[PDB]
């Protein structure tokens, strides 16, 4: 369980594709680009680390 704020809300789509590729569920409030990501905790870090290579987001623990 962590939280993400995209720099740009248009990148919601690229967020939901990285999340599915790491079997983590990302619940995004589209209009503000703020998401709650839940899944298994080993994989939250690689999800954060490959989401970080394409889109800009800040993460909360």
């Amino acid at each position: 369980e962590q939280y993400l704020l995209l720099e740009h809300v248009k990148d919601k789509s690229k967020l939901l594709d990285t999340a599915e590729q790491f079997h983590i569920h990302a619940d995004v409030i589209e209009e503000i680009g703020f998401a709650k990501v839940t899944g298994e905790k080993q994989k939250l870090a690689p999800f954060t680390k490959k989401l970080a290579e394409k889109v800009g987001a800040d993460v909360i623990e």
Binding site: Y3, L5, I29, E31, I32, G33, F34, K36, D58, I60, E61
Partner: protein, 337 residues
């Protein structure tokens, strides 16, 4: 020819009007009911702990579709803590005919800032003209704190962009929020946010409630009462300084209520969480009157303007750190229209 009376049924007990002193003040002894009782198609979003959907006083105004529980992902089925029902009654007693929609983001354990934002956005997209958030968090503005605030600010921007008013309780810590920020690096959210109207609580005497948070963010005040004017120092509770609330009818109310023969469905209470919805209720009244007179919707700024100019200027002359622009009075609001 009949004396005016509260919209609440009060179980027919005429003595309960004493505890509705705040409502009589707001509505000019309920004269506003014949000036503007509110429109059923003006909707106030209740971001709170759910709602007692079949409360005798609230069921006529409850959104027929009920509302969403974000904690369990189910439609709202009731109100476990009673908090949202108390908040709902304050909207209702001022504007008995506006629609109230519960967005349940709180229960016993508390709530998540995330669900408040989601409810804000949904409430906007669902055609609500007013949002009331009678809860908040004290957030440290470290790295993750600033991100939460940044997120929260976008939600507020979204409501403002769509001309939706958002009213929030200022909080009950009896602290100066500006001093809290410089000393503790904390902020009270969402009340501190731009485009969120932060509301404090005054007493029957119009003195600020001792618990009411103060600061430059305070915009308005409303009568939320307290246990006593000086209870904090002398231990004495003056029950006439408290305010009546609608309380879940199937829930036991307090020993103080029982001793005063307040039947279930009502409870004596206090707080900024009870002040904010009085202003939200007043806003819904202004929107209802304005739409009735022009068949156009007013801007958020227009309603805010009416609230601001009709407020009673208390304390230092002008917008001060204790009362903001001052105490909101619904009948004055309508009178200036």
């Amino acid at each position: 020819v009949i004396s005016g009376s509260p919209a609440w049924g009060l179980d027919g007990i005429l003595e309960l009007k004493e505890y509705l002193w705040f409502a009589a003040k707001q509505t000019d002894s309920y004269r506003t009911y014949q000036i503007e009782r509110g429109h059923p198609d003006v909707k106030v979003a209740l971001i709170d702990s759910g709602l007692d959907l079949d409360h005798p006083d609230l069921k006529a105004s409850v959104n027929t579709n009920g509302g969403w529980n974000y904690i369990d992902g189910k439609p709202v089925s009731g109100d476990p803590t009673g908090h949202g029902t108390q908040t709902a009654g304050m909207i209702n007693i001022i504007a008995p005919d506006v629609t109230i929609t519960p967005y349940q983001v709180l229960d016993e354990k508390g709530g998540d800032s995330y669900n408040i934002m989601k409810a804000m956005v949904d409430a906007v997209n669902d055609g609500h003209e007013v949002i009331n958030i009678s809860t908040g968090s004290y957030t440290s503005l470290d790295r993750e704190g600033k991100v939460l605030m940044k997120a929260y600010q976008r939600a507020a921007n979204y409501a403002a962009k769509h001309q939706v008013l958002v009213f929030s309780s200022a909080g009950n810590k009896g602290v100066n929020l500006d001093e809290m920020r410089k000393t503790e690096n904390k902020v009270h959210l969402p009340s501190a946010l731009k485009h969120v109207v932060s509301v404090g609580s005054n007493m029957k005497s119009n003195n600020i409630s001792p618990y009411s948070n103060q600061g430059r963010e305070i915009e308005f005040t409303a009568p939320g009462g307290y246990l006593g004017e000086t209870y904090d120092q002398d231990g004495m509770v003056r029950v006439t300084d408290l305010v009546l609330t609608t309380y879940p009818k199937g829930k036991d109310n307090t020993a103080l209520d029982q001793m005063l023969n307040i039947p279930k469905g009502y409870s004596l209470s206090y707080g900024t969480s009870l002040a904010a919805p009085q202003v939200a209720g007043t806003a819904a009244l202004v929107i209802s009157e304005y739409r009735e007179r022009h068949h156009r919707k007013p801007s958020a700024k227009q309603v805010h303007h009416i609230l601001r100019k009709s407020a009673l200027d208390l304390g230092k002359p002008g917008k001060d750190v204790i009362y903001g622009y001052g105490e909101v009075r619904a009948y004055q609001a309508l009178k200036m229209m």
